[PDB]
Design an enzyme around this catalytic site. Sequence first.
Site, PDB file in Angstrom:
ATOM      1  N   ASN A  86       1.155   6.048   4.871  1.00 56.25           N
ATOM      2  CA  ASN A  86       1.119   5.231   3.659  1.00 56.25           C
ATOM      3  C   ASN A  86      -0.144   4.368   3.702  1.00 56.25           C
ATOM      4  OD1 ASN A  86       1.447   3.229   1.661  1.00 56.25           O
ATOM      5  ND2 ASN A  86       3.676   3.115   1.958  1.00 56.25           N
ATOM      6  N   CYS A 101       0.778  -1.496  -3.141  1.00 51.81           N
ATOM      7  CA  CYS A 101       0.737  -0.046  -3.313  1.00 51.81           C
ATOM      8  C   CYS A 101       0.454   0.405  -4.743  1.00 51.81           C
ATOM      9  CB  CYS A 101       2.050   0.560  -2.831  1.00 51.81           C
ATOM     10  SG  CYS A 101       2.460   0.110  -1.129  1.00 51.81           S
ATOM     11  N   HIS A 156       2.378   8.049  -5.064  1.00 50.65           N
ATOM     12  CA  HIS A 156       1.969   7.217  -3.952  1.00 50.65           C
ATOM     13  C   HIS A 156       2.610   7.909  -2.746  1.00 50.65           C
ATOM     14  CE1 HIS A 156       1.373   3.820  -1.350  1.00 50.65           C
ATOM     15  NE2 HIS A 156       2.671   3.608  -1.220  1.00 50.65           N
TER      16      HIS A 156
END
Lengths: 309, 308
Positions: free
Chosen positions: A266, A111, A236
């Site tokens: 996500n 990520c 994020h």
Amino acid sequence: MGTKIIGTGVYLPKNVLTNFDLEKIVDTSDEWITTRTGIKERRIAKEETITYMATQAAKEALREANLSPEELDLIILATLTPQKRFPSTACLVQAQLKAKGVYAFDISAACSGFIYALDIADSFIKSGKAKNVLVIGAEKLSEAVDWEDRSTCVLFGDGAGAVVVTRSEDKSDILATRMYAEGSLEELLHADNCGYIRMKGRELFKVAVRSMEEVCREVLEKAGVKPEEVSLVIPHQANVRIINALAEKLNIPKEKVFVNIQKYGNTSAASIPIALHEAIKEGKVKRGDLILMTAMGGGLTWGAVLLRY
Amino acid sequence: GTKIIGTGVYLPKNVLTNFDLEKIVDTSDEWITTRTGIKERRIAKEETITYMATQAAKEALREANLSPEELDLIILATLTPQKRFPSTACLVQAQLKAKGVYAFDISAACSGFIYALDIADSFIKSGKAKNVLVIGAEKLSEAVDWEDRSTCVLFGDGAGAVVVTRSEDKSDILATRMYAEGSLEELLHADNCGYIRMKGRELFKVAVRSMEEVCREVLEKAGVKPEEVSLVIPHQANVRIINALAEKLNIPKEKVFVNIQKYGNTSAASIPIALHEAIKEGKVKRGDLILMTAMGGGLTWGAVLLRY
């Protein structure tokens, strides 16, 4: 002066998967997913390959930068779902873009992939080793998701985001960056023997808020910028609740925190670049604005980047 | 400038000789030796890529007299990562106890190490990092088609590492040039199963031309001639390709370091392993101009010229 963003682009798979659709896949519900994460739907690259998605996001970004593929000095692609062992997906994409002979490679940081990649690009520009750099965050997470595990399969989506940065002589520039990693915390978020995403949700949430807050405060101090002076925070997109707890800890109003997790879920490395593109297209980002990007990912990688658009 | 203050390696103790190979595929010591210059390679049995990388890094850190926590960044280049994620660089970081240290893996196959060293150099030169650990580690034995004699006699396993720092002396990376050409994926790629495949003859030819060109490019960039280079440390792909390159650059074999005869081709680990040995054997001294070059899958290739 400055590493300046002169173009952004994205690619969002054609197939949309709502929480309702998922209810028929695993024992879950729209109410649960929505309230515990804020996710309403997610894209799935059922038809597209990682290479295809990355190439499309890159093309739009290059078009916006009004830059030919051959004018690039470097191509950096962050992903945890590479097309193959080798060549790197960055090379496959370079081929599709016809960026002949252009320096290209992938990086692994989950990520945190995009901010890691952007930090690298900045290092190349600030060292005078590169002028035009293409940074891509692309993921086909659906291939790494255990669709029988209602615990993790409802959090991830696919897609690609890209940005083109160059060395400008104006005021646009990355003011500060700080990246960290902690392999001793692998267990909180990692892939298993078969590459499936596994995590410890509760512990991860705590660490997420605390870590992103810390590094965000670090870049702000280093840049001599106060939280109130941040024009927009593009974090994020892992969980709306994490984003909210982070905003609270940094004393930054919700109105200055960009969120689009509700429509994409996500998307790991592609998360921030996709949010940046939409933020710009939604008229929420103008030259001079101070943008704060931050993330945390598997391997326990995390960091922040503060820049003046 | 960017100075190498420590180097290290790790090689499994298991040796795969050409005679062992004769027992598993229809090949011979004569053919292998003559066509590749390879006699032996090391094969990892109980070691994971993380273990080997960690051992190479530990030696490099000891050589540099630097503790793991004094590192600002860790870059690991491999095509045989431990898992999907975390990166093997993160796993290595945990084993080193380099708490909180910035770390990631990069993919550039055989050009893995020089790509990583180039990145390290960018961080030091931009003043964003002072101490960087760069690792080249591969457990290629897992990606080799052992049913295939045309390629299974070329690879070995190993790890090499260097610790570079910002120094206030003349040590420095003088010039670097990295290229990639995706349209030439077919010459050297992994198939749908991860197995190493290649168009040997075409890759051999393209290898020399591209490597000569990039080497010449870093040299005219640094303002130095091949005759002014103390040592050439090329990726250990094929002694014959090495000789062709040396011939083109007009550099005597005495100035070209090769240890492929005992370790085979270890992809990303190739150069750092050769560098470490060259240093240990007194072949590299402070002030010497060292030229590193390689070409790998994806068709990545480049060169680094530095003053040790």
